Design a protein around this nucleic acid. Structure first.
Ligand SMILES: [Mg+2]
Ligand SMILES: [Mg+2]
Ligand SMILES: [Mg+2]
Ligand SMILES: [Mg+2]
Ligand SMILES: [Mg+2]
Ligand SMILES: [Mg+2]
Ligand SMILES: [Mg+2]
Ligand SMILES: [Mg+2]
Ligand SMILES: [Mg+2]
Ligand SMILES: [Mg+2]
Ligand SMILES: [Mg+2]
Ligand SMILES: [Mg+2]
Ligand SMILES: [Mg+2]
Ligand SMILES: [Mg+2]
Ligand SMILES: [Zn+2]
Lengths: 64, 100, 196, 55
RNA sequence: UUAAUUGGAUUCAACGCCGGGAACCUCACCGGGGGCGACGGCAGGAUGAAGGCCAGGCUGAAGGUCUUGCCGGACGCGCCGAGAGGAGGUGCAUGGCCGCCGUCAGCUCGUACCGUGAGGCGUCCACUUAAGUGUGGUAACGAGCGAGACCCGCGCCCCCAGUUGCCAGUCCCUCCCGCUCGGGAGGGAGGCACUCUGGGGGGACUGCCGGCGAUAAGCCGGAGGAAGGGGCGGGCGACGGUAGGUCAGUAUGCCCCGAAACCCCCGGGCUACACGCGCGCUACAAUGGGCGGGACAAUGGGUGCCGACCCCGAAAGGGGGAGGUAAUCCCCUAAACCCGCCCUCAGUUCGGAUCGCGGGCUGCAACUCGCCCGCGUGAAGCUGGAAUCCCUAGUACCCGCGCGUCAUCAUCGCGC
């Protein structure tokens, strides 16, 4: 089961609202931005957060 | 005319600190030093039965102890030899010096 | 070879530590440290009541030095006594204190609550205390006291939480005391902060 | 001499030549790398010696 | 059954389990022989207590005791308390640790609300997940521990490092072959390319594409990729219960023994044998047996030790002995597999139990009761009723090796 974790979602939503004009639909750009904007040390957690942020960006751009 | 230094410790970070100090001492002087060569790690593994009695399913513990090692060669120069002789190693690092 | 050298030194410290722990029980023993100098060995002892350790102007420190040099393999020992750094963040000290309080005759609930109150007051994220034995009758029982944040399983529980165990010898038998404490600076893996 | 009726013989091999340095038991002694400890005593002092359960 | 054949455990969760491969010791059992009472006090004691000995009897052997007389100087179990010690009883008096329910998804809290009350709600419904894992609806709104996160290893790439590890290209010397145009093997220079060793970093996120579902949570199928959907294998086991196991690892209350139930020494036993059962090894042969020849490993360990190399012996073994406190020296040129010849479906050139004679090693000691070698002997067994066990990929089957135990001894455990 590939179920996203709660704190991943929470931190991703907090980052998205704080800097709406900072993330694009590109995974690498979001990965670097997440690396620089937080104190996360685990490489896996960074990837999870960046992926969810990418999904959020493309979902809001589509307008739901 | 060369000295050989052997280092061994159970903590990797302290070993790195001592090696970096020796490297900097060699750098602050005109003297050629062969880089720190990593030798194979020593692993001590012991497997024991868990229960004190003999009843129940048999389960086991696997305890492990790791010892890391480094090797450095440097040419014997008294200006640098005294500096490395006065460095203070942590209590969990073993150092040995010999002339070849 | 080299492996035999490392193991030999580790056993000496374990034996000396157990001997001191059993010996200096009333002085609030809190660990030791051994350092090797070209002149000999510096042995630092942590305690809460250094007066009991020194024992009325010597006559106890000299005895400890003699015992360490003869019974154990320490060469030219030199004992210094210091003070425990964070007594309310050390689980072993608190467990021994609770055991002594029980041996005095205090009801176990009062001792547990007083200890938890002090520990949480001195700035701890979480504490748990477990007491087992023949409390109030001849059928044994176990009770558990808890408050705060405390991580029971996984790697963080292994490397962050401090644990201690102690035995209390009463008239009717022994009572086991277990204490677990989490320091204020512990950070779990899922605690991420946003840099402003 | 009456004290000679209590001393033990100095054995150099067999199960009676080795005792745990912590509890004095005969039998399951771990002899690896110079340790002299029972399998019971080794479990509860292994973390203090620096051993860990990695896997 | 016996003098004793010491004891615990009996469905899963007792029965190669108590790391339990016991010759002495271990030892707790049986036969026999000796020794032990801090500290208080009672008889006694320099006119010498307590204690020790050359020889010879008793004895398995013993200044243990006795005979025979020599020793030394302050305490005194002949007596009363008390004490040391106890593998003696109690795991149904306890601590700690371990097995199982179960790596299952559970167990609770603050305030509010419902019920006279025990209690209820949240923790329910629909879909979804390995998961009380999530998304929506709801008298609930929010939290904690567990799950996940976390830690160790394996597979792909990059940087740094070059010894005790590696040897492709280049140079020199020596020796072989088809006589050398060409092709090989050693040694020395020299090098860090390749392999390896070990620090740091990259890489995978349902990220991209198409469907289903609700447009959510997710699910199914493709590209590219070393790796695709917990990437694969491990560590870590919540609140509790099981009067589950352990006081015979250690700690510990009560009761017992306390000149024996404590401490030593000698010889026995735990190894007995009409019989029932568990787990295994070797076979019942050609998908083989024998003889000669040819190939390719990894994990670990070594100073009370590993021992190359030379000599003697048919073998097991024996006499010297370099190097090694170890990426340097050693254990260490595995077996299954391949090639050639004999046997041709037979209780046999299958099987190797049982027994005779002889030669060795360890050890203070090999009969009870150890392991190895040579020649001889040659049992049951010709595929197994009713029943019943393990396993989903480098897994199962088949084949050997290393460590633990260990003076000697592996049909075992843990690993390769
Ligand atoms: Mg029995
Ligand atoms: Mg065994
Ligand atoms: Mg045996
Ligand atoms: Mg015996
Ligand atoms: Mg019980
Ligand atoms: Mg009401
Ligand atoms: Mg209900
Ligand atoms: Mg949960
Ligand atoms: Mg987990
Ligand atoms: Mg019971
Ligand atoms: Mg037996
Ligand atoms: Mg045959
Ligand atoms: Mg025999
Ligand atoms: Mg046949
Ligand atoms: Zn022990």
């Amino acid at each position: 089961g590939k179920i996203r974790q709660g704190f991943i979602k929470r931190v991703a939503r907090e980052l998205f609202n704080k800097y709406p004009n900072e993330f694009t639909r590109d995974f690498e750009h979001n990965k670097k931005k997440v690396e620089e904007l937080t104190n996360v040390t685990s490489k896996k957690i960074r990837n999870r957060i960046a992926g969810y942020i990418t999904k959020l960006v493309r979902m809001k751009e589509e307008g739901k | 005319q060369k000295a050989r230094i052997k280092l061994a410790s159970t903590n990797v970070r302290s070993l790195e600190e001592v090696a970096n100090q020796i490297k900097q001492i060699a750098e602050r002087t005109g003297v050629r030093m062969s880089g720190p060569i990593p030798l194979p790690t020593k692993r001590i593994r012991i497997v024991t039965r868990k229960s004190p009695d003999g009843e129940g399913s048999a389960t086991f513990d696997r305890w492990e102890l790791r010892i890391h090692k480094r090797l450095i060669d440097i040419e014997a120069d008294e200006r640098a030899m005294r500096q490395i002789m006065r460095i203070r190693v942590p209590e969990d690092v073993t150092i040995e010096i010999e002339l070849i | 070879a080299i492996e035999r050298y490392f193991i030999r030194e580790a056993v000496k410290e374990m034996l000396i530590d157990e001997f001191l722990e059993k010996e200096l029980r009333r002085a609030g023993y809190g660990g030791l440290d051994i350092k090797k100098t070209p002149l000999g060995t510096k042995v630092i002892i942590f305690a809460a009541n250094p007066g009991y350790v020194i024992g009325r102007g010597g006559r106890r420190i000299r005895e400890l030095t003699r015992i360490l040099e003869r019974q154990f393999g320490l060469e030219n020992p030199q004992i210094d006594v210091q003070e425990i750094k964070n007594p309310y963040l050390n689980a072993k000290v608190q467990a021994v204190r609770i055991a002594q309080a029980l041996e005095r005759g205090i009801h176990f609930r009062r001792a547990a609550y007083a200890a938890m109150r002090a520990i949480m007051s001195n700035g701890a994220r979480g504490v748990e205390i477990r007491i087992s034995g023949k409390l109030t009758g001849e059928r044994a029982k176990s009770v558990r006291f808890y408050q705060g944040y405390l991580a029971k399983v996984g790697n963080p529980a292994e490397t962050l939480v401090s644990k201690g165990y102690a035995q209390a010898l009463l008239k009717l038998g022994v009572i086991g005391v277990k204490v677990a404490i989490m320091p204020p600076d512990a950070r779990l893996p899922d605690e991420i902060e946003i840099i402003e | 001499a009456k004290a000679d009726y209590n001393k033990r013989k100095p054995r150099k091999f067999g199960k009676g030549a080795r005792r745990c340095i912590r509890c004095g038991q005969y039998g399951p002694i771990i002899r690896i790398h110079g340790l002299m400890l029972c399998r019971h005593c080794f479990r509860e002092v292994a973390p203090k010696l620096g051993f860990r359960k990695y896997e």
